[PDB]
Amino acid sequence: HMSKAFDLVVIGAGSGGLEAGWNAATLYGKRVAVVDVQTSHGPPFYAALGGTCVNVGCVPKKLMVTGAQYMDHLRESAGFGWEFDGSSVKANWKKLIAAKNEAVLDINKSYEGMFNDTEGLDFFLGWGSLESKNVVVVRETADPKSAVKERLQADHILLATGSWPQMPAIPGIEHCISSNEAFYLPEPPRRVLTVGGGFISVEFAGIFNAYKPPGGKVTLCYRNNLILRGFDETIREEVTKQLTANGIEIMTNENPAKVSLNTDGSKHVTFESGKTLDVDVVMMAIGRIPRTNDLQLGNVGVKLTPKGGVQVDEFSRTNVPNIYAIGDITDRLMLTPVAINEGAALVDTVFGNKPRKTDHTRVASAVFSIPPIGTCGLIEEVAAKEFEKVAVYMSSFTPLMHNISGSKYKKFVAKIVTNHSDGTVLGVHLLGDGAPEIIQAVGVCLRLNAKISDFYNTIGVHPTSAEELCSMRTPSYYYVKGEKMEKLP
Amino acid sequence: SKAFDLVVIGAGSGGLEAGWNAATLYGKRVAVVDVQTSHGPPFYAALGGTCVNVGCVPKKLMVTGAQYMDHLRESAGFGWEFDGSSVKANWKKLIAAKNEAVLDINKSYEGMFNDTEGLDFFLGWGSLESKNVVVVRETADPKSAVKERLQADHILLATGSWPQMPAIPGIEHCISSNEAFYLPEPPRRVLTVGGGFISVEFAGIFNAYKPPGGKVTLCYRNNLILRGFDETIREEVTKQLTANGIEIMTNENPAKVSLNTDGSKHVTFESGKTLDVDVVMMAIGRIPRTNDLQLGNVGVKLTPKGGVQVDEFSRTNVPNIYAIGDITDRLMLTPVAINEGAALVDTVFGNKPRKTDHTRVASAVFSIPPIGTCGLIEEVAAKEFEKVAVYMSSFTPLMHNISGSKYKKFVAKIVTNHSDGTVLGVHLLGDGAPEIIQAVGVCLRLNAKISDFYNTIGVHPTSAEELCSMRTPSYYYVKGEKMEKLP
Ligand SMILES: Cc1cc2nc3c(=O)[nH]c(=O)nc-3n(C[C@H](O)[C@H](O)[C@H](O)COP(=O)(O)OP(=O)(O)OC[C@H]3O[C@@H](n4cnc5c(N)ncnc54)[C@H](O)[C@@H]3O)c2cc1C
Ligand SMILES: Cc1cc2nc3c(=O)[nH]c(=O)nc-3n(C[C@H](O)[C@H](O)[C@H](O)COP(=O)(O)OP(=O)(O)OC[C@H]3O[C@@H](n4cnc5c(N)ncnc54)[C@H](O)[C@@H]3O)c2cc1C
Ligand SMILES: CN1CCN(C(=O)Nc2ccccc2)CC1
Ligand SMILES: CN1CCN(C(=O)Nc2ccccc2)CC1
Ligand SMILES: [Br-]
Ligand SMILES: [Br-]
Ligand SMILES: [Br-]
Ligand SMILES: [Br-]
Structure with a gap:
């Protein structure tokens, strides 16, 4: 069995990686290989072909927020004259999750067919890492001792592996989940604590609040004084009030210190302050970190920033001439349309003789x-x-x-x-x-x-x-x- | 007899913007005339204008209400379960909530007049007595009792528009959008006549609040509704209205309407087709409201189409008399009438001419x-x-x-x-x-x-x-x- 050779090898078939790969092959006639670890959504690796947005990100979460909005619509309709049996209303979380799964899988399948049909755009399944300046190895697992499935020769290499949830090192952290697991909960939690003040914690607080079973309660905690750092302060204060008005308890200036199991199997959270809370699910959403550990960047000397992401210049170039990086792995603006923009600009610059840099303002x-x-x-x-x-x-x-x-x-x-x-x-x-x-x-x-x-x-x-x-x-x-x-x- | 810098006939979208800006921004003495202090029968429009009383504001609330028909059905795909057989749409509750919101706006405008220096409201029907005199009478009849005589350096015509009704036998058994806002019961079968936005918007409102067994029909005399909008969109909204149960009759036009013994209406179309409905709402157009102004007393010129003729700065042919809003028969939108009123005052009473951009x-x-x-x-x-x-x-x-x-x-x-x-x-x-x-x-x-x-x-x-x-x-x-x- 022989290695295959390409103009461009992309590690990570996500928002940015797919934009770069498709544009390089269809606009400029280059030969492209794209590597990802899974062909469709969910456990064990959650993200898959299509990226984090498609599989466990913007696309499913928006469908779930849309579903959660109906709790408000049903109640608000009465002021406009709508009458119905309020005691009959039930929010069926299993149906929501099944509908979401089917929508995401349809996208997975369509991406799979793009590769079968497109000249010069090939997909390889496995874990990609850097062996040398011009060779990407694809292994069976993230362990660099696992078996080699392919070696991909590359003139140019794009790192676009995205990010991953960060989990704090507290006793009992094994009793907690991240947003990845939240997308697959078999039943909606009666009591849930979402930990973090950012958009993922806030968005999931809204989703759980609408689908909670009778007598449920959603609590959001944040270690500083006011959620949603980085956004307008008037809006930060107002969102807090409107979450509160819809029944969500917001615990600011609080942070979990440990988690243990009660005798009935529920989670007993103790905060640094000494307050306690019993919940059925603890979802950590305290940040996401770039996914660099498995790339073996030491083999070629790609420099990371102090924060931990791949260092890049304004044209997405690393310190190694022919190796580039875009998307969450650069640990800047973690948004799907920014990764897509960076990918298109990179490919126009490298293969299109039309240099262009992404505007991050x-x-x-x-x-x-x-x-x-x-x-x-x-x-x-x-x-x-x-x-x-x-x-x-x-x-x-x-x-x-x-x-x-x-x-x-x-x-x-x-x-x-x-x-x-x-x-x-x-x-x-x-x-x-x-x-x-x-x-x-x-x-x-x-x-x-x-x-x-x-x-x-x-x-x-x-x-x-x-x-x-x-x-x-x-x-x-x-x-x-x-x-x-x-x-x- | 009373003296003013500016007299505004019509306390509507454009007229209130003009009067408030003249008084508070330029210290002028302003009088504003309207025929009614709050919404509804008998004159429908009132203090605040058509948009506030029988226009954008109430219709948007009613469209919001009608959207819940879609939200309730669509929630099911996202896992929401409830007893569908128990759902009903209470039109009376909708109308009462709408009436309370409009009335609150009416009262708010009253207090604005009571609180603003040099801004006075007069109740009645305004017309032009002479080039610098506006008369306010008890009714639209130009021989009813004089209530006020207002001399004015400047006169602004801002009386808006009115529903156009075709000259067909039995037109008196039809309503317009004015009456639609006050129907005691949601019509079970309704025909909305016209291809424009008012007909289309009310078709969707009636479609959501119709009682069991109901049916909404919209007819339009030409081949495709919503002339003046993008053609792809005219075709698609036709398709999506049909998908929600509304019957679109194109290339059809009522020729007469007659009374049935049960109180419903029998419509005969020019083609020979017939249709029995409970309500026929005519929405075939709106025309400038010029008849009660006695424009002949001063010689204000109209266009062949019936609008008051104006130049780009809203000036009529008679010096110191101006016209803005729907009475000029151009773009019949509330934000345009507001913009025209403010441009006019900035021109007349400030030192910077300004003209509205209608593109x-x-x-x-x-x-x-x-x-x-x-x-x-x-x-x-x-x-x-x-x-x-x-x-x-x-x-x-x-x-x-x-x-x-x-x-x-x-x-x-x-x-x-x-x-x-x-x-x-x-x-x-x-x-x-x-x-x-x-x-x-x-x-x-x-x-x-x-x-x-x-x-x-x-x-x-x-x-x-x-x-x-x-x-x-x-x-x-x-x-x-x-x-x-x-x-
Ligand atoms: C819950 C959630 C909600 C979000 N909502 C939004 C939103 O509404 N709007 C928005 O703009 N952004 C949103 N985002 C952010 C968005 O998902 C990311 O900014 C975007 O997906 C980053 O694109 P990327 O190309 O950097 O990586 P990704 O899209 O993450 O793709 C990286 C891919 O690399 C694969 N991979 C990783 N390591 C390897 C390896 N060694 N070998 C091979 N493949 C590998 C992964 O499986 C993954 O498919 C959300 C994120 C989350 C977590
Ligand atoms: C059903 C409907 C829906 C609409 N929806 C929208 C929408 O969503 N958005 C939008 O931009 N536009 C909408 N419009 C149009 C909008 O209402 C008008 O463009 C706007 O109100 C006209 O402003 P104006 O200043 O010309 O007059 P108006 O606001 O009509 O005010 C004229 C006033 O003059 C008074 N009046 C009339 N004659 C006399 C007289 N002789 N003496 C004293 N007072 C008199 C009337 O009572 C009335 O209060 C809608 C119209 C209708 C009918
Ligand atoms: C960039 N856009 C994205 C949206 N889009 C679609 O076609 N949407 C769609 C709808 C349902 C199933 C699959 C895709 C147009 C192009
Ligand atoms: C120009 N806008 C108009 C809307 N608006 C309001 O004040 N609206 C409002 C509505 C209902 C109750 C209280 C206020 C802001 C200014
Ligand atoms: Br459920
Ligand atoms: Br018509
Ligand atoms: Br046509
Ligand atoms: Br400005």
Whole structure:
């Protein structure tokens, strides 16, 4: 049996790796091999062909949040005249999980067929690692002593293996799960603790809250004072209130110290403070770390950053000339469309004689909390460090429909942050139904260097939430040399 | 007799914007006239305007209510179980909640008048007595009792529009959207007449709240509903309305309506076909509301179509008399009337002329599912530009393969000047489309090109990211003719 040779070998058939591989083969006629550890979703390795987003990430979690939203819809419908037997309502988690599994598997199968049909784009099943500057080895397991399935000669090598959940080293950590296992729970937990203040903890808190059996309770804990670091602070505070209003208990300034099993098999959590909580599931969502351990990067000398991700320049190049890295493995912005963009730019540069680097600024993104967040660009306290004068335009109100629905706690927040010296829009931050859909074209605006006057001159679409972005002409307040104040001096 | 800088006839979308801005931003003395202080019969529109009282605001609440018919059925695919036989749609509860919200807005505008210096409200019917005198009378009759005589340096006509009713035998047994907002019971069988957004939106409202055995029919005299919107979307919304149980009768037009002994209506179409319904709602158009203004007293000129004629700065032919909003018979949208009112006041009472831009105005249809659009449709672009490219994406979103509403294709189209990539129009059909389109309207004011969309990083997973995923045209227009490939 002989080794096979390629222009490009991609380790990791995920969001970025598949974009790079497909573009290299179909746009530029190169011979490409792509390596992944599993052909469809789930245990044992969870991620698989298609990547983390497709298998245990954006795609299934969005379907599950959509399912969770129906708890709100069913209740809110009564204000509009809908009547039905409320005591008959049940949330069948097994049906949700089965429908999600079938959708993800359909995507898996379609990716499998792309490889069969596409000239110069081949898929190899196994664990990829670096043997030398121009040889990728594919083994049966992540153990470098496991059997060799293939050796792939490569002129160019792309590392795109993504990330993995981080688990804290506390006694009893073996009684806990991550988001990977959450996607496959046989039954919805009656009592669950989600640990972490980031988007995965918050999103799963919403999902469990809707599907919990009778008498259930969802608790989210976070070790610092206010969840969702990195997002607009008004929105951080409001999401906390609206989660609380829908029955989720938020424990800030708390952190698990150990976990043990009660005699009935439930989990007994003791926090560093000495508080205790009995739950049926502990889901850790305290961060994700780049997946570099299994690549054997020492064999070729690829440098990692202090944080632990592959060091890259603006063109995704490592310190080894023909070896590149994109996506979560670079430990920067961990978003699927950023990995895809980096992959396309890399391939245009290397094989297309059209150099291009990814712009990591002004990236629009969302949190599918209930209600959701959409954001693009800088938060005001960051802007205040860079610009002498910052203006903040802010509208916050319960929309009229939620005065009828009964969910009066659902305040919509729209904020625009500007460089007041010239009006340029530095960031836009939204909380409320539709926010992830509204924010997409906002990203186009910011890439075109829109000013606040460009928004205000635009005629609103009425009645919408989005029109609030086009009706703000006077700052709510300012930052002058870093200092917050209602008026300029 | 009382003296004012500005007298506004019509306390509506544009008239309230103009009056409030004149008083608070320019310190002027302002009087505003309307015929009713709160919503509903007998005059329907009132303080706040058509949008507030019998327009955008209440109809959006009722469309939201109607969407729950879809949400309840679609929840099942995501594991929600309940007793489907127990579901019923209480129209009376919907109407009462709508009435309370509108009334709250009416009261809010009252207090705005009580709280604002130099801004006064007068109840009654305004007309032009002379070039600088506005008379307020008890009724629309120009011989009813005078209540006020208002002299004005400047007069603003802002009386809006009114439903058009065809001259057919039995038209008196039909209603318009005005009465639809106040029906005591949801009609079991209803015919909505017209192909425009009001007919389409009410068809979806009635379809969700109809009692058992009910049926909604929409008829339209030409071949395809929603003229002026993107053709792909006109066809798809036809298909998706049909998929939800609405009967679309194209190339049909009522010729007469008669009374049945049980109180229902017998409609006879020009083709000879007949249909018995409980309610016939006419939504074939709205026309400028000019008859009660006595424009003959001063000589304000109308267009052949019946709008008050204006220049780009909303000026009539009579100096110091202006017109904005639906009475000018242009774009009949609330945000446009607001923009015109503010531009007018900035011009007259400030030192910077401003004119409203009527191009690239984003708008929506709250059909189920809804439409969002901004800018030119491809056949209008093809007449103005030598080379037009159309970028098209149309698919059923993954969630609706699970929900069971597989008919709900999302449609996204981008129309460009292919000579330089400039985006000329964007057209959307699907959940969230009115919200997605708003910032697209900002993009078109930054001369966005298709590559500006495609080079922007998407937000995933959303429907909106489709707008940033389209690189290659689906087809073209060259010198006005449609073709798949360039020549
Ligand atoms: C729960 C969750 C929700 C998320 N939601 C969103 C969202 O809504 N929006 C968003 O933009 N992002 C979201 N993300 C992030 C998104 O999933 C990642 O940013 C994106 O998938 C990273 O792409 P990538 O190409 O770096 O790697 P991935 O898509 O992770 O692909 C890496 C692949 O490498 C394979 N692999 C690993 N090691 C090896 C090896 N040695 N040999 C061969 N193959 C290997 C893995 O099996 C995997 O398939 C979410 C993530 C999670 C965990
Ligand atoms: C069913 C329906 C739905 C709509 N939905 C939308 C939508 O979703 N979005 C949108 O943008 N637009 C919508 N519109 C259009 C919108 O309502 C109008 O464009 C807007 O209200 C017109 O503003 P205006 O200032 O011209 O007049 P209006 O807001 O109509 O106000 C005119 C006022 O003048 C008063 N008046 C009339 N004659 C006299 C007189 N002689 N003396 C004193 N007062 C008088 C009337 O009582 C009324 O209050 C809708 C319209 C309808 C009918
Ligand atoms: C221009 N916008 C209009 C909407 N809006 C509100 O204040 N709305 C509102 C609705 C119901 C109760 C309270 C407030 C913000 C400004
Ligand atoms: C970039 N987009 C992604 C979405 N998309 C689809 O076709 N969606 C789809 C729907 C159901 C099953 C499979 C795919 C168009 C292209
Ligand atoms: Br279950
Ligand atoms: Br401005
Ligand atoms: Br018609
Ligand atoms: Br037609």
